[PDB]
Amino acid sequence: PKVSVIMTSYNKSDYVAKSISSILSQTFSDFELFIMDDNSNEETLNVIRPFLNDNRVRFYQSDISGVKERTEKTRYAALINQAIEMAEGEYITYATDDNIYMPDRLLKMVRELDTHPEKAVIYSASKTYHLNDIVKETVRPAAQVTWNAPCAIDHCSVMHRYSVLEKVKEKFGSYWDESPAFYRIGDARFFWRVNHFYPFYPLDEELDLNYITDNEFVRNLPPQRNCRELRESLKKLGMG
Ligand SMILES: Cc1cn([C@H]2C[C@H](O)[C@@H](COP(=O)(O)OP(=O)(O)O)O2)c(=O)[nH]c1=O
Ligand SMILES: [Mg+2]
Ligand SMILES: [Mg+2]
Ligand SMILES: [Mn+2]
């Protein structure tokens, strides 16, 4: 397939169907969809189950269980890294169980990369609906080429050439960073790695959607490193 969509899933029974469905109904149909479930509850598994009937879905379920295992690594990064190793697509993109793809997302992103061989990483604008019907709408723009993606661009707004992954692994030893110190902003940390070698090219269109309302787990992670740290290191890096 031209595109490998890598989605992660953990206990979002009320939302995961809409997420999956938004991918399976894309106008661009030449993709494989990895559903990397991190050993979710019964309710979640049962919502996902019918979608496994779609011949494009490649479902993998971990055996992870308990606070030690959930806090040993940034789980989604480990899952994403696993999927990357199995991916057959020329282009790679990410999805989650709480994010919705707009119908022409894959089509528009694939066209951008097909058309511009010089661009390796692209990103679109993203929209979040704050609920309570809608009380607030937040848009994350995609107006400029950027060498400083961390915390400015979301997990779910990017597509890149597979070849990007080689470079990243060559320097850092892995693709996404599994260190649990980057649990809250794992996307930013992976974008930080990519930004050592590639700028992110914009698609001034809103192509993904989030809905939001306007623990022994938290207490067992290491101190969390933050955005500022990443942005300053890239500014010092001085690639742009
Ligand atoms: C907590 C956890 C999340 N995940 C997945 C669920 C989501 O697809 C992804 C991000 O988690 P999420 O809870 O959405 O974090 P955020 O606070 O950024 O919204 O990680 C796992 O795979 N394993 C886990 O143990
Ligand atoms: Mg061009
Ligand atoms: Mg996030
Ligand atoms: Mn989320």
CB atoms within 10 A of CB 127: 16
Nearest to 3 by CA among 25, 33, 26: 33
CA distance 82 to 166: 15
Which residues, listed in sequence order, are joined to residue 213 by a DSSP beta bridge?
A: 131
| Residue span of the structural domain in which 220 resides | 1-240
Ligand found nearest the CA of 12: 1
Is residue 54 packed enough to be buried (19+ CB in 10 Å), middle (13-18) or exposed (0-12)? middle
Using alpha carbons only, what angle is made at residue 196 by residues 191 and 201, rounded to the nearest 5 degrees?
60
Active site residues: 187
CA distance 21 to 145: 31
What totals of helices (H) and strands (E) does the chain contain, helices first?
8, 9
* CB distance 146 to ligand 1 below 6 Å: no
Is the Cα torsion angle 89, 95, 97, 99 positive or negative in sign? negative
* CB distance 79 to ligand 1 below 6 Å: yes
The domain that holds 111 is classified in CATH as 3.90.550.10
Breaks (C-N over 2.5 A) in the chain follow: 132, 214
75: enclosing H helix or E strand: helix 75-86
| Number of structural domains found in the chain | 1
Output the CA–CA distances (angstroms, integers) from residue 235 to 73, 192, 198, in the order listed: 27, 11, 14
Residue pair 160/92 in contact (Cβ under 8 Å)? The answer is yes
**Resolution as reported, in Å:** 2.0
For this PDB entry, the determination method is X-ray
Q: What length does the chain have?
A: 240
Q: Nearest residue CA, atom 20 of ligand 1?
A: 76
Residue 110 phi, psi dihedral angles, 5° rounding: -60, -45
Nearest to 123 by CA among 187, 76, 34, 28: 187
92: enclosing H helix or E strand: strand 91-96
Instruction: Count Cβ neighbours within 10 Å for each residue of 203-214 and write b for 16 or more, e otherwise.
Output: beebbbbbeeee
* Ligand 4 ion: Cβ-proximal residues, 5 Å cutoff: 98
Residues whose CB falls within 8 Å of the CB of residue 130, separated by 6 or more in sequence, listed in order: 136, 137, 138, 212, 213, 214
Atom of ligand 1 nearest to the CA of 97: 8
Distance 97 CA to ligand 1 centre (A): 8
Residue pair 197/170 in contact (Cβ under 8 Å)? The answer is no
